[PDB]
Amino acid sequence: MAQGTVKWFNAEKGFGFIAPDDGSADVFVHYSEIQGNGFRTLEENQKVEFEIGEGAKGPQAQQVHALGGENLYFQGHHHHHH
Numbered sequence: 001m002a003q004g005t006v007k008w009f010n011a012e013k014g015f016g017f018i019a020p021d022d023g024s025a026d027v028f029v030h031y032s033e034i035q036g037n038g039f040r041t042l043e044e045n046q047k048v049e050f051e052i053g054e055g056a057k058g059p060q061a062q063q064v065h066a067l068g069g070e071n072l073y074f075q076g077h078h079h080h081h082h
Contacts, residue, residue, distance in 0.1 A: 002027070003049045003067065009042040018048055018061055027052050027059040034064040042066060 002020045006029060009016025014031030027050065031040035042048060047069035050061035 002052050006042040006046050006048050008044050011041040025059050027061045028055055028057045029061045029064055033062045036066050
């Protein structure tokens, strides 16, 4: 297993790269391997968990589950006070 942060992901094409927490070997992401909430996509600068395997472009992220990270959205901006 491995975790990291998707450094960039092309949602249109369905591929990208993650910077693993394991020292970041630049793991290649592919939408078919992504395990999301219905989406097979990732957001740039998002935390993620995956399994590094061997692909044509080097290390490939298999079973790519989006961890998220910054989950404090829609709690501010407009009236962070009752």
